[PDB]
Swiss-Prot record:
The system is composed of three essential subunits: KdpA, KdpB and KdpC. The complex also contains KdpF, a small non-essential subunit. The KdpFABC complex exists as a dimer above concentrations of 30-50 nM, whereas the complex exists as a functional monomer at lower concentrations. This is Potassium-transporting ATPase ATP-binding subunit. It comes from the Bacteria. ATP binds at residues 29, 33, 62-69, 80. Induction: Transcriptionally regulated by the KdpD/KdpE two-component regulatory system. Belongs to the cation transport ATPase (P-type) (TC 3.A.3) family. Type IA subfamily. Changing residue 62 to A: Loss of ATPase activity. The chain holds residues 316 to 451 of 682 of the full protein. Changing residue 62 to Y: Slight decrease in ATPase activity. It is found in: Cell inner membrane. Changing residue 69 to A/T: Decrease in ATPase activity. The gene is kdpB. A protein-embedded tunnel connects the potassium ion in KdpA to a water molecule at the canonical cation site in the transmembrane domain of KdpB. The structures suggest a translocation pathway for potassium via two inter-subunit half-channels along KdpA and KdpB, integrating KdpB directly in the transport process. The periplasmic potassium ion probably enters the selectivity filter of KdpA, travels through the water-filled tunnel to reach KdpB, and is released to the cytoplasm by KdpB. KdpB undergoes conformational changes, whereas KdpA, KdpC and KdpF remain static. It comes from Escherichia coli (strain K12). Part of the high-affinity ATP-driven potassium transport (or Kdp) system, which catalyzes the hydrolysis of ATP coupled with the electrogenic transport of potassium into the cytoplasm. This subunit is responsible for energy coupling to the transport system and for the release of the potassium ions to the cytoplasm.
């Protein structure tokens, strides 16, 4: 039972930009968080959705083998995965992730939150830090 609580941009991308790509990479996620993230973008910075049906883009459902999921379209390629999965994906692209944000991902882990990293092209556009909620 975890939901996105806040996300920080990787260096070179605005947080709202991170939230929009955070959404398209999270459209096809079947994880409970997959809905929390797409709502995290709308409530915090931009009530917005995906543009796959207008652009004819492809969703990539989350797989446990890579522990990540994302979306690809003509003009954009973005993914969202565990920092370990996405970070391996950026270096495999030949790209790099921002250390200040990879550290912020580390801080989300130590507070008990789950840092998902979302990338666009071969770099990270930001991390989505998800937090746990309390219920009786």
């Amino acid at each position: 039972n975890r939901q996105a609580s806040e996300f920080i941009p990787a260096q070179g991308v605005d947080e709202k930009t991170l939230a929009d790509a955070a959404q398209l990479a999270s459209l096809a996620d079947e994880t409970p968080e997959g809905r929390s993230i797409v709502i995290l973008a709308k409530q915090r910075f931009n009530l917005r959705e995906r543009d796959v049906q207008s652009l004819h883009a492809t969703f990539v459902p989350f797989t446990a083998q890579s522990r990540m999921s994302g979306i690809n379209i003509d003009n954009r390629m973005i993914r969202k995965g565990s920092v370990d999965a996405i970070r391996r994906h950026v270096e495999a692209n030949g790209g790099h992730f921002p250390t200040d944000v990879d550290q912020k991902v580390d801080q989300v882990a130590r507070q008990g939150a789950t840092p998902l990293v979302v990338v666009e092209g071969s770099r990270v556009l930001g991390v989505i830090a998800l937090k746990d909620i309390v219920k009786g």
